[PDB]
Write a protein that binds this ligand. Structure first.
Ligand SMILES: CCCCCCCC/C=C\CCCCCCCC(=O)O[C@H](COC(=O)CCCCCCC/C=C/CCCCCCCC)COP(=O)(O)OCCN
Lengths: 59, 71
């Protein structure tokens, strides 16, 4: 069993072309990436307070 | 006495594990985005129209005061 990663064909109707043009001219995906980075700032950092805290070890 | 005890999955196995790509579409048509842009442009144009006409009238008033004071 195998999969295709990049075998999609963009639709050529007027609405889809207009959507792609709006993406080009208004930077929708750039704003989406900015939005993920913003959301990701508002969560707890993963940093521990060495040397007062120590990483987990095992026997 | 004691029986075998080693790391095993729990009876019935584990729950399902998500692996499919999940990139949902936030959703707004190009028509709607362009219309919002054009609408805010039109509102700004109208507001600037009224404000700049008022500014012209104010400038004419100031010029009249200067003309009255000139002699
Ligand atoms: C009825 C009369 C109305 C009067 C006319 C008005 C109509 C306006 C409709 C269109 C206006 C849109 C123009 C705005 C800018 C467009 C420029 C543009 O789209 O360029 C992009 C490129 O733009 C970029 O990608 C630059 C991004 C660089 C990274 C910076 C990220 C910034 C995004 C975060 C938000 C930024 C906020 C900006 C506003 C700040 C306000 C102070 C195209 O390049 P490509 O997609 O690579 O392809 C071109 C070859 N075919």
């Amino acid at each position: 069993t195998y999969k295709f990663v990049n075998m999609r064909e963009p639709s050529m109707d007027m609405k889809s072309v207009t959507d792609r043009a709006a993406q080009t001219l208004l930077w929708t995906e750039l704003v989406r990436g900015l939005g993920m980075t913003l959301s990701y700032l508002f969560r707890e950092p993963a940093t521990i307070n060495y040397p007062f805290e120590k990483g987990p070890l095992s026997p | 006495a004691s029986k075998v005890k080693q790391d095993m999955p729990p009876p019935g196995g584990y729950g399902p594990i998500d692996y499919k790509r999940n990139l949902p579409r936030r959703g707004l048509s190009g028509y709607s985005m362009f219309a919002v842009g054009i609408g805010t442009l039109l509102f700004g144009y109208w507001s600037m129209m009224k404000w700049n006409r008022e500014r012209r009238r104010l400038q004419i008033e100031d010029f009249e005061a200067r003309i009255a004071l000139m002699p």
